[PDB]
Ligand binder design. Structure first.
Ligand SMILES: *[C@@H]1O[C@H](CO)[C@@H](O[C@@H]2O[C@H](CO)[C@@H](O[C@@H]3O[C@H](CO)[C@@H](O)[C@H](O[C@H]4O[C@H](CO)[C@@H](O)[C@H](O)[C@@H]4O)[C@@H]3O)[C@H](O)[C@H]2NC(C)=O)[C@H](O)[C@H]1NC(C)=O
Ligand SMILES: *[C@@H]1O[C@H](CO)[C@@H](O[C@@H]2O[C@H](CO)[C@@H](O)[C@H](O)[C@H]2NC(C)=O)[C@H](O)[C@H]1NC(C)=O
Ligand SMILES: *[C@@H]1O[C@H](CO)[C@@H](O[C@@H]2O[C@H](CO)[C@@H](O)[C@H](O)[C@H]2NC(C)=O)[C@H](O)[C@H]1NC(C)=O
Ligand SMILES: *[C@@H]1O[C@H](CO)[C@@H](O[C@@H]2O[C@H](CO)[C@@H](O)[C@H](O)[C@H]2NC(C)=O)[C@H](O)[C@H]1NC(C)=O
Ligand SMILES: *[C@@H]1O[C@H](CO)[C@@H](O)[C@H](O)[C@H]1NC(C)=O
Ligand SMILES: *[C@@H]1O[C@H](CO)[C@@H](O)[C@H](O)[C@H]1NC(C)=O
Ligand SMILES: *[C@@H]1O[C@H](CO)[C@@H](O)[C@H](O)[C@H]1NC(C)=O
Lengths: 170, 106, 222, 52, 206, 170, 170
């Protein structure tokens, strides 16, 4: 990914994360737990869905037969037809290849972007209360129970509540 | 004391399409497809010949309606629907080939 | 056909308030696609932006740091105008004041502060000197003849002169005023005409001094 | 009309434009924008609009 | 914003280039104005390279980093003006463009004071120098053949938008008593267009 | 936006910001003030202008008439012409759609990039003197007057000057 | 670059860096030294190489002559052929221009991305032991000898080893 999160500083994906694209995995006195983030997951889904809406569609132009499979047309005009058709085949094959390559590059970079955005959103939330690990983990200095972890996920987390304890723990 | 970053927006934006979304509203947009026609043959700077009643192929044979076009000189030649190549009835063999030649003739 | 028309007194006493108005026609003071500015010009300071107001789903004002403590620019949406108010004036505020529209002309929707239309200007003098009327004397013609009017001893600037109520413009020269040692201004306006037309055509100079509300006509004859 | 200048012509007149595409006439001749089916294709010249 | 040169003369048809040096370079934000005497500035070039509405094709702008240029491809008499560049809200100091045109000698006229003015106790004598080029001229007052000094003021017009000439007025001011004490009032004019000085005069009460 | 600043952590745009694309809004003892940043604004403008220079241009190729509107050509050759023209219409309509979609995606992401770049440039300027709010705001710990705010905008700001006061305020 | 590292906060490139695309330049008691980073360099190289593998290839379609250079074909059919060929020339010239422009934009942004990724990877490594300069430099508070600098480059650097000394130096 262009941003360097997916297949980047985040070592690998979670096969257990079946409910979402992106999620949180925590460690605290109470144990371990994993939860998907739907806002980031939905943003990625909506954008991929948009590409498919664009690519799966009508070319309303209807083309009639201009040659004949049973009784071949004159050879001069027939050769012009075939040359023109083969030229169009070449253009469209090239177009299709480039479209899919371009869209795939963007799709991968897009997913990588959404992962990065979620990470940075969390980093800003708990400023001066935690430090970046480098594996996509935040080491939190104060005690953070399941209600505290769920507040981070929820986005209600209040850093000023735990700042004195966390800051002083450095 | 604090300083804040931002970007401008407008109440009435303009909708565009992207690869990922339809009808994304942006600050600005400029049309790339021309829809406006000028209902005249804009001929400034070109020697123009408007054939009118004279058919292009009539310039070679000379029915009465083509009497003023027997030796014309032109950068731009204009055929009209009312143009006729003939007086005594008939037609050219390979007529369109000949029209294509004369259209490019100068 | 946007037109900015400027009014307000061109004489302000030191320490008091300068008040000018710009009346807009052809566009709206509250238009999304306009910014309404004041700019002044003096032979010393050159061209100097003063401030602005504009509407973008609420009114905004910005002012030049040099006048920020003294200046107010307010829109009137009843009369489609905007004003300039400058408090505590000093001789350094003597200048020509212009209103001007910007932000009509933009680079991709970003006001780039292009001033596409300007008002005619209001010359403002800061002085404790009472205004005085200008005396007008003929400069009599004695195959081309020259005649004129001497416009003497007025304060402050400006004076305007026309001929035959504006029907005569060709060959007219109205000279820039000179400040005399008395501290009053003077100028002349002259015109060259066919000497033959002296016996038939009437020549009258029309002199206007708006600060003193003076309008005077003077017949000039051989 | 000798008062306007154009290099793209069709039976209905002249396409005067610097745009890359046109939806006026598929049989226009001369030096022309390329004909497309769509009536409009708006190109963004600014950022996403996020109003208050 | 800093302009160069501060002023220049050029003949009709000349290519004229004016420069603005800017603290910081932004193509979009730099515009040019033309201001004729007694008028508001008019916007000629906006965004550096774009012509204002109504602006003839002989005017063009270029930009390169912090240096910006206004060019008049072929100068015209009507282009006599002062030019100001602008970036954001700061205006350059301006460049005065004067026209160089063939030499033309002044037509000279003298006007005695009016009988009306005399009754006020002052007399004003005005020497008109009409439609001359170039601007340099000397005007001397003589009263009963005595050279005057320190009792006259001159005023000069801006270049004419049609013929590019100047006009000049000199006004001699005397008390009525001083005016009535003398007979011959003479205005002597030196201009390089004349083969020798021209003198116009009148005799009091004639 | 791909970076997640515009329509991202920056909640919304400023309608009052009429002089620029990107700008600063401050709060200090002296009050509030808004100012546009031209360097970032110009970079975005120059890049959009570049796209337009590319897209608004000459196709010097001139095409002559190959059929006839008044007296229709032979039906076989006429059908070949029409088939070929309609095929070209299909190619170009597809090309135009994809061009504009691709360019629009990039244009939006480009603007979002420039906003992010300006934010990160400021963050680096006042390192250890302020903290990220999360709304695109920097909470500055020391007293910062209008000359101090203007130094941040100008890019002359000297963090070492106010570091003892700001650091100790944590 | 889209990310704003190359031709961005990193003022300029190093002509002396001949062995790599991206590298490190240090300053410590022992002096100065420059070293290329191959992992980032290889990632960029592999990706550019991928584009070239895609673009330098076979169009297996073979086209025969359909007109004649020595004895010109009939004028009607000849004009149809020429119109069709010129239309194809127009399509392909447009395609080639857009392909190269699109790929070049991505190639420049890609290189800029890899530079940014390397910078952020280092920043995370020495968290709370150094501070961002803003020129792409990390001011390190503790004493860092050549073995310490080589540990940063190598990616083995252990921040906990020098954290007490570095943190207390603020
Ligand atoms: C996105 O940015 C573009 C610029 O790239 C911007 O487009 C500009 O729109 C204005 C109209 O709002 C155009 O201005 C016109 O200029 C012509 C001369 O070139 C004038 O004749 C026009 O005058 C009309 O309106 C006047 C009163 O306002 C009348 O007096 C007159 O009779 C006319 O009716 C008008 O001033 C300008 O040309 C474009 N710019 C370009 C490069 O084409 C656009 O508005 C931006 N989009 C949004 C939504 O802001
Ligand atoms: C145009 O192309 C078609 C095939 O796309 C050619 O027809 C085929 O010819 C092969 C052997 O040459 C036959 O076995 C097939 O039956 C044909 N296929 C079809 C679909 O007709 C045809 O020969 C070409 N035209 C000319 C003038 O050569
Ligand atoms: C090729 O296409 C043209 C139109 O693009 C066809 O001509 C039109 O036919 C309709 C009805 O069929 C008429 O009403 C129009 O006057 C025609 N338009 C023009 C521009 O000529 C033409 O029939 C097609 N060619 C063939 C061989 O079918
Ligand atoms: C089709 O195009 C070819 C060129 O691509 C035309 O042939 C050329 O004509 C020029 C002058 O008109 C000659 O000097 C060249 O010798 C020709 N070149 C080749 C490669 O043949 C040809 O005229 C065009 N066809 C029609 C019907 O006009
Ligand atoms: C977020 O989740 C927590 C669980 O710790 C819950 O108590 C809180 O109400 C949630 N926030 C909102 C706004 O509902
Ligand atoms: C930046 O702006 C400040 C205003 O606080 C000014 O004093 C300073 O001189 C400016 N910097 C430069 C390099 O001019
Ligand atoms: C990394 O480089 C250092 C040089 O300081 C070396 O001693 C160390 O063994 C290297 N790391 C590994 C895993 O080899």
């Amino acid at each position: 990914g262009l941003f360097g999160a997916i297949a980047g500083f985040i070592e690998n994906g979670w096969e257990g994360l079946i409910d979402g694209w992106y999620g949180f995995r925590h460690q605290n006195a109470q144990g371990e737990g994993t939860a998907a983030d739907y806002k980031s997951t939905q943003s990625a889904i909506d954008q991929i869905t948009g590409k498919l809406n664009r690519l799966i569609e009508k070319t309303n132009q209807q083309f009639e037969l201009i040659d004949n499979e049973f009784t071949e047309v004159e050879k001069q005009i027939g050769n012009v037809i075939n040359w023109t058709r083969d030229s169009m085949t070449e253009v469209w094959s090239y177009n299709a290849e480039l479209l899919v390559a371009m869209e795939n590059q963007h799709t991968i970079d897009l997913a990588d972007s959404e992962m990065n955005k979620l990470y940075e959103r969390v980093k800003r939330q708990l400023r001066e209360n935690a430090e970046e690990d480098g594996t996509g983990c935040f080491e939190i200095f104060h005690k953070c129970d399941d209600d505290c972890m769920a507040s981070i996920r929820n986005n209600t987390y209040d850093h000023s509540r735990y700042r004195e304890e966390a800051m002083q723990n450095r | 004391d604090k300083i804040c970053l931002g970007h401008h927006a407008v109440s009435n934006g303009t909708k565009v399409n992207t690869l990922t979304e339809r009808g994304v509203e942006v600050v600005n947009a400029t049309e790339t497809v021309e829809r406006t026609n000028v209902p005249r043959i804009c001929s400034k700077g070109k020697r123009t010949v408007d054939l009118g009643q004279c058919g292009l192929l009539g310039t070679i044979t000379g029915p009465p309606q083509c009497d003023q076009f027997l030796e014309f000189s032109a950068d731009l030649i204009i055929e009209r629907r009312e143009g006729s190549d003939v007086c005594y009835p008939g037609k050219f063999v390979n007529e369109e080939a000949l029209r294509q030649i004369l259209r490019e003739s100068g | 056909q946007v037109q900015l028309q400027q009014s307000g007194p061109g004489l302000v006493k030191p320490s008091q308030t300068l008040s000018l108005t710009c009346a807009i026609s052809g566009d709206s003071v509250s238009s999304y696609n306009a910014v309404w500015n004041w700019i002044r010009q003096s032979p010393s300071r050159g061209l100097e932006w003063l401030g602005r107001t504009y509407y973008r789903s609420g009114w905004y004002n910005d002012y030049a740091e040099s006048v920020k403590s003294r200046i107010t620019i307010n829109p009137d949406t009843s009369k489609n105008q905007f004003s300039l108010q400058l408090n505590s004036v000093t001789p350094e505020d003597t200048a020509v004041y212009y209103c001007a529209r910007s932000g009509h002309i933009t680079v991709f929707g970003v006001n780039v502060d292009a001033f596409d239309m300007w008002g005619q200007g209001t010359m403002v003098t800061v002085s404790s000197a009472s205004t005085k009327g200008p005396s007008v004397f003929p400069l009599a013609p004695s195959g081309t003849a020259a005649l004129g009017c001497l416009v003497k001893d007025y304060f402050p600037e400006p004076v305007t002169v026309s001929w035959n109520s504006g029907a005569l413009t060709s060959g007219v020269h109205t000279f820039p005023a000179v400040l005399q040692s008395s501290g009053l201004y003077s100028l002349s306006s002259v015109v060259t005409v066919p000497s033959s037309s002296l016996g038939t055509q009437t020549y009258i100079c029309n002199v206007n001094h708006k600060p003193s509300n003076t309008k005077v006509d003077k017949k000039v004859e051989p | 009309d000798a008062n306007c200048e154009g290099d793209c012509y069709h039976s209905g007149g002249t396409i005067i434009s610097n745009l890359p595409f046109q939806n006026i006439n598929s049989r226009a001749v001369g030096k022309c924008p390329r004909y497309v089916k769509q009536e409009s294709l708006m190109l963004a010249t600014g950022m996403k609009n996020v109003p208050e | 914003m800093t302009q160069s040169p501060s002023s220049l003369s050029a003949s009709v048809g000349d290519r004229v280039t004016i420069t603005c040096r800017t603290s910081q370079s932004l193509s979009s934000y730099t515009h040019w104005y033309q201001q004729k005497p007694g008028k508001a500035p008019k916007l000629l070039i906006y965004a550096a390279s774009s012509r204002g509405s109504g602006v003839p094709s002989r005017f063009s702008g270029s930009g390169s980093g912090t240096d910006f240029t206004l060019t008049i491809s072929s100068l015209q008499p009507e282009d006599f003006a002062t030019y100001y560049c602008q970036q954001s809200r700061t205006f350059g100091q301006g460049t005065k463009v004067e026209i160089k045109r063939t030499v033309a000698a002044p037509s000279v006229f003298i006007f005695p004071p009016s009988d009306e003015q005399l009754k006020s106790g002052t007399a004003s004598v005005v020497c008109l120098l009409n439609n001359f080029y170039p601007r340099e001229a000397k005007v001397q007052w003589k009263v009963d053949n005595a050279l005057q000094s320190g009792n006259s003021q001159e005023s000069v017009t801006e270049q004419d938008s049609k013929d590019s000439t100047y006009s000049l007025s000199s006004t001699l001011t005397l008390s009525k008593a001083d005016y009535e004490k003398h007979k011959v009032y003479a205005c002597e004019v030196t201009h390089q267009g004349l083969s020798s000085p021209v003198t116009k005069s009148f005799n009091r009460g004639e």
